Amino acid sequence: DVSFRLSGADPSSYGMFIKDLRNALPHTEKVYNIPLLLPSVSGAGRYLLMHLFNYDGNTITVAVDVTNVYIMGYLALTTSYFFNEPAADLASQYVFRSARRKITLPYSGNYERLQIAAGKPREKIPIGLPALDTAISTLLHYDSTAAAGALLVLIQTTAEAARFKYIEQQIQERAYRDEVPSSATISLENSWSGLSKQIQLAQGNNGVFRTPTVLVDSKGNRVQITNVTSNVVTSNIQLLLNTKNI
């Protein structure tokens, strides 16, 4: 399992957590020196448990599918909660079975559905360490509309930061002040599957993407990534979604 405490958190302890989160995901091969997540994992070992503690020391445990860093659901005291989608129903066969009750949230875990539930796109929702403290708190007691925004903050400050060193750094810059994500951050989130696939297709194509990926850079400028020499590939991305899942 991995753990993160908001009480006393700072950039260093958050970076320790994101390192532990990346290290908890199994991989047998690296592609262009980036860990390649597994095609599949059977049974309970598919799910990583992340123990998150708010500033007061209250906790939720979040289950994450290790093949794709997707959060499936979470446990808060004696209640489990899962997205309304078959992968999360499957996960509920393995994790948090000791909960006294299981609630299926009234949306799936994808960004489009969560933003509809929350009433706002993630361009407008601040993220940071304080926002993560608020999100954990929100999730302690059921409120499906509030939970959708909390889950948009939780997914970006845990999974997305694990996938991309740029997003990890964005959250560290927001350790004591939330701020909406940069458009670069949104672009990377939306591009993770495409980048993961193109980096894998470049292995028998001399390092060249079969199809360019368009990203927004740190200045708001839209840019084409065409091969593995780009800084997105050599520096930023940390985990590849296996093409078997794309």
Ligand SMILES: CC(=O)N[C@@H]1[C@@H](O)[C@H](O)[C@@H](CO)O[C@H]1O
């Ligand atoms: C950890 C998690 O659940 N993450 C996903 C994010 O990976 C994905 O791009 C988005 C789909 O739009 O859905 C969120 O659920």
Ligand SMILES: *[C@@H]1O[C@H](CO)[C@@H](O)[C@H](O)[C@H]1NC(C)=O
């Ligand atoms: C590869 O990537 C860089 C941009 O990072 C670009 O300048 C270069 O000319 C590209 N080369 C090919 C072969 O696509």
